[PDB]
Design a protein around this ligand. Structure first.
Ligand code: NI
Ligand code: NI
Ligand code: NI
Ligand code: NI
Ligand code: NI
Lengths: 311, 311, 311, 311, 311
């Protein structure tokens, strides 16, 4: 088999569509997601044209090996898609209608800068390589691009599944390549982060600040060091659900900043004890009373600055 | 091969049945379960009809490639099912009886709102796409729907395995689609959660309340902060076996609430110490004595409110 | 190909044997184990009978596709076995000798009630479904059931590999099914549990009891709360390599009970401090002296009761 | 099919090229990385030469089975590459242009000596074994060696992808072997290690040094022992993202050294208490004041020595 | 195809060789290792004899399907090897030279008794089953047994790769089997265990011994209990990289022994406090001074005894 011959000099247009059946395993660390979908393909092959009166059939069903089929591939997949041909139908004018159901593990970078209040645009790149006989170009039929209503991605809200209608045509290894960008827009369900991570982390930090209403150095050391220990258990838990980033994240910035608050609280507790031992308690009292206001105020202002820089 | 021709204009009815052989790996985090079952299919193909007197056989056995077989698929599967044809039998009137044994990893959402006292309805969606020649519709043969008595799902009680007899007929990519819903009802075995998670978590909380029978600030700080540390090691264990939900769960609500009790206990311990340093112990004594009753009472009432809202 | 015809009306007997080559990956959490073995099959097919003088051969070697072979399946496997046919030999009287080497992941429930002093009976269920032409029944040739001497299952002692000679014949979807039970008896090597889990867990508990020889409330709080923290680090470890059981395990019972001992020790430490603050030390001293005997005695008796209930 | 015959006695030159499409899963522990790329092959087969005037075609497209293709393998792969032939083009002189898209898991040792400020040279070894008819030699077509601009390896900067143009020709199992070395140079994005590991680890260490401004033995013991506990919860995190190295790593050296600082701090805290109990506080004061300068100074100088030895 | 006929009654000798290309993933817990190697086979098949003068050719090249090839298998593999035939060369006398490149996951038990100063003998068992026509026996061609110089097994030193030249011939399921033992001798690179596990574990133990230079019960309780807590984080980290054994390991013995030292240190700290409260400090002082010598001395002697028993 060889590609359909051009009537003039035009490229062969292969109309595409992806219909999502299942979306699962969005792996934040691996920056992958698994997909199960329908891939629809359509092109004109005049050599397959027939007369409906003479043949007695209005449509002709072929096996993939019997006819020419464009070699359509995905760019950003781990391995080639697991595909099963559902139907191949040829109309009298030779219009081929191809339908396959496939499953694939897709590589798609994630921007964690605004985590856990982030939105992502997952990509599925469709590609076709031109042949020596003729150039093959891809097109999107938007009416054949969609998703099942039941498509759910645990911990995410699915906004839209669309395609950038204009393909990216370029040369690769002395042959033209036609690339389509299918985009799955998702937004993170941040709800659970508030009672499970944000508030417990704030509670232990506020507990360390009770040392500003205590003159007992031994109890203060216990308060600040134990909550810092209680905080270490929380930081590690964050940096095992996310991959190693070259940039600063919203949550990473807050987590780092909270260490400074523990560090300055230890300095305050040390300074307070040192002055009282040095028979300067009136002074230690001024630093401790100022700390009661300074620590929550600086914490609030630093968080407003951070939220502003990130959002 | 082509589909059986209609006598009038009627759709081809494909009778289905699923008999569960094995149920395993209910993954709460992934919201998947693995299944090993028999899939039975039945339809009339008049082109395969025969005379029993002339043929000398009452039933004819065919290989899948020899005859037309409907392309039946599962909607909510990770990859296409691993299937092995067991038998194909044709009766004299042309009624085909197809039997295959398959294994599949099924995507089925779980509602954790009442965890660990939750019940679930797992779904297995059977689907068939109509062909150009004729429309294919699915039906349930209730006599061929069941499960092996030995079918066990570790940590769960299997209630029933039934099918919604009326299919969901709809258009998908300019063709008719007939969908059946097979439902596996299960209820969680909550027993082990009581001695392993609930009671140990309550023990450490009650230990923090012993600070209400102590005037020693340094020992009180040690009691409340250390048990809060012990509590942290328990929340992490629970959350890592469940996915991220946009709603509040029963266990998550209790776990969050217990933090407030640790936080208020620290305030009480701080207030008590502050008043005694300020030479107001009669007052500190009133707050501490009230706390002895308030903390268990508010804990009991808040749990009654939570149990009411969730059940 | 069709099944061998019956001389009278008798069912076709398929003699079976399983010879274990490798046993690996006994997964306690998943309740699975992997197996690599030989599966031998034997049956009489008179249509394959030949004269040795005329044919010039004493044995005939066939390809699986050339002759009729019974569809033998395993009941309790995750997916269908990975099998490779080794040999098919036909004797002059039509006796077929089939041999395949296979590998499979087997689902077999484990009873953890006596863990880590437990024994298990792993099962491999062989099954055959009858055909319309005739009924197929399975048989065990005990001389063809065995295991390689080098077969090792890490952390377990392999006792025996036998088969329940009488098959379980039953009707399933209007056809006879013949099921054989192959049993692999194993006993857990409990040795390492003594120095690695049991004794370290007992050491920290006995360390908490040193608080009964101390009047220092602050040191006592540190002793009991820190060892309870040390006990938490050991419980989590056990409840990860074990599934969520609807019943109570031997180790689970001991682990739960040890919490009560920590809880009562905290009450004692609190009661002791409260009485001394109330200028009643003679009384606190009586409770503390009684606790020195009561705690180890109640611990010993409760363990004797538990060992009796479980063994 | 047989290899192309030599015109004189020359070896057959197979021109190669690798174009990277995807780079993912650089597993530090396993010392592997996954690759998805184009493999281009080119050689002259005179038996396939044709006249463009007579044939009416300027290029001829063949199926892999129709013509002779060199058996090209990768040396350092876990299993054989998953390959799909994209195109086979023959020019009139018989120059074959072969193109396949493949995916493979590559074994490439990593040098962690300078971690997390390390750079690596990943290798992909191409190999061909000579046949009895003639010797096959590999060559690099630099114009067909490259990478997609979007090629990203999470946590790494991709510097270059080049090939050592001269093959390593050698005898292996009584036949000639021609080996090419494709090199992917990468440098680690160390940025995130500073706020997530380096600074938190330094904060807890500096917190232990506050004991040099305290005379309270009980608070000092709490400061140094608790931060050492906090440090233990950091060493474990690093040594589980790397394999077992026979040499010393930069990070491993720092982590080990920090233990000595905790150990000497405990000695100082013990010596200080011992002298004060022995009524020698003037002396304990001299050691404590010296420690305030000695500990940060020795820490800085030891880190300068380490940085010098490693970089 | 059928096996080569015997000239007299002798068994067919199949000469074997394994050449290691890659060694990776030595999994201590699973007791497996992955291998990528060349498997060479050689046997005489007189039916393939030819005259070099008449045929012109000195060697004949065949496709695997064209000639008879012995069914060679590996005993201790998880699944059947992934094999690709490289070459099949037939010499004038009928001597066949077969070469394949394979990859396999090998099951090989590991003796952890001397861990981390252990050496292992990994096994690769080659096997052939005799046929009805004649008996097949295996032999080792030592000239075809080896390994690539670049073969590296991370964390191990590769000593030798040899074969036990004499096969183990035995009857299995009424046929002869010929088994060869290929041995890969390796020794563990223990270096990193010293700064990463051994010394940090010793540091925390020595820190607990500072309690013998302190009269402060509350600081002593903090010293011994906190380092015991710091020790638990080091036993779990070790016993998760190794499987459960029925015997005792070197590292396991040391780890167990260190618990006794923590336990006796708590007794000493308790006895010291008890005597001082009982107005017997002269006696408490004698026990504490003796402990300063006894604890390091008994630790050294117990380690000498352990090293002697294990090495
Ligand atoms: Ni497929
Ligand atoms: Ni299958
Ligand atoms: Ni197989
Ligand atoms: Ni492929
Ligand atoms: Ni292969």
């Amino acid at each position: 088999v060889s590609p359909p011959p051009p009537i003039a000099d035009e490229p062969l247009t292969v109309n595409t569509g992806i219909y999502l059946i299942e979306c699962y395993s969005l792996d934040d660390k691996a920056e992958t997601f698994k997909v199960n979908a329908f891939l629809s393909l359509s092109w004109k092959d005049r050599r397959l044209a027939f007369d409906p009166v003479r043949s007695g059939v209005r449509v002709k069903t072929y096996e993939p090996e019997a006819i020419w089929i464009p070699e359509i591939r995905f760019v950003n997949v781990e391995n080639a898609r697991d595909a099963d041909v559902v139907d191949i139908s040829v109309s009298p004018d030779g219009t081929v209608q191809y339908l396959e159901r496939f499953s694939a593990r897709v590589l798609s970078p994630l921007d964690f800068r605004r985590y856990p209040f982030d939105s992502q645009t997952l990509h599925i790149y469709l590609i076709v390589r031109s042949v020596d006989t003729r150039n093959i170009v891809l097109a999107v039929d938007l009416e054949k691009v969609g998703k099942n209503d039941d498509v759910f991605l645990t911990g995410w809200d699915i906004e839209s599944f669309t395609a950038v209608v204009k393909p990216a045509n370029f040369a690769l290894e002395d042959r033209l390549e036609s690339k389509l960008d299918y985009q799955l827009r998702i937004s993170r369900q941040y709800f659970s982060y508030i009672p499970n991570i944000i508030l417990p982390m704030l509670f232990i930090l506020f507990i360390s600040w009770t040392a500003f209403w205590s003159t007992s150095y031994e109890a203060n050391v216990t308060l600040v060091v134990s909550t810092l220990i209680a905080h270490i258990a929380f930081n590690i838990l964050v940096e095992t659900n996310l991959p190693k980033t070259p940039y600063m994240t919203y949550t990473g910035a807050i987590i780092f900043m909270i260490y400074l608050f523990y560090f300055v609280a230890v300095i305050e507790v040390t300074v307070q004890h040192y002055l009282k031992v040095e028979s300067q308690p009136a002074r230690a009292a001024s630093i401790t009373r100022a700390s009661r206001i300074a620590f929550p105020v600086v914490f609030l202002l630093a968080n407003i600055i951070l939220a502003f820089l990130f959002f």
